[PDB]
Design an enzyme around this catalytic site. Structure first.
Site, PDB file in Angstrom:
ATOM      1  CG  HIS A  10     -34.924   3.610  47.733  1.00  0.00           C
ATOM      2  ND1 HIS A  10     -34.675   3.452  46.393  1.00  0.00           N
ATOM      3  CD2 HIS A  10     -33.956   4.426  48.214  1.00  0.00           C
ATOM      4  CE1 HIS A  10     -33.594   4.152  46.065  1.00  0.00           C
ATOM      5  NE2 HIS A  10     -33.145   4.746  47.149  1.00  0.00           N
TER       6      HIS A  10
ATOM      7  CB  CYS B 294     -30.927  -1.194  45.735  1.00  0.00           C
ATOM      8  SG  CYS B 294     -32.118  -0.308  44.701  1.00  0.00           S
TER       9      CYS B 294
END
Length: 145
Positions: free
Chosen positions: A50, A111
């Site tokens: 993440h 991301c």
């Protein structure tokens, strides 16, 4: 536990535990495998991490990884050394970057922003060498607390 080993990218101060499976529970724990079948040091070894608002957490810092930085991976039996050969930003729909390959490679996926995004940053590294993990190597590339 669901821990299978560790991954380290010293150029961007990444030192994390590797978990089996990318699920909502393992989201903030560390790096997570993306295929049930992937093997360390063989084919493609895709890992998801993440990107948090704290840019120092998890796979946040791999945004600043360049070629050819070293990526270190271990199952606490062998030390697998990869070298970054490509860095790119893709759409999340392009799942192809997860698929296994003939060449031995590692695929780091995060991301491109800490906010909601359909875009992913990808770092690919080709396997350069494999060796038995020793106390010295473990403490050097995967150091503690």
């Amino acid at each position: 536990d669901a821990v299978v080993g560790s991954i380290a990218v010293p150029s961007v101060d990444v030192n994390l535990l590797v978990f089996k499976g990318t699920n909502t529970a393992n989201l903030l724990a560390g790096a997570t495998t993306m295929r049930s079948d992937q093997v360390m040091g063989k084919g493609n070894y895709p890992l998801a991490g993440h990107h948090m608002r704290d840019e120092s957490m998890l796979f946040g810092p791999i945004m600043k990884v360049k070629k050819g930085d070293k990526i270190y991976l271990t199952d606490l039996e062998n030390l697998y050394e990869y070298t970054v050969t490509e860095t790119k930003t893709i759409d999340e729909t392009e799942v192809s970057v997860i698929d296994n390959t003939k060449d031995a490679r590692i695929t780091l996926i995060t991301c491109d922003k800490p906010t909601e995004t359909t875009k992913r940053f990808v770092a690919v590294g080709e396997l350069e060498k494999t060796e038995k993990l020793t106390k010295e190597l473990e403490n050097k590339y995967f150091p503690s607390k």
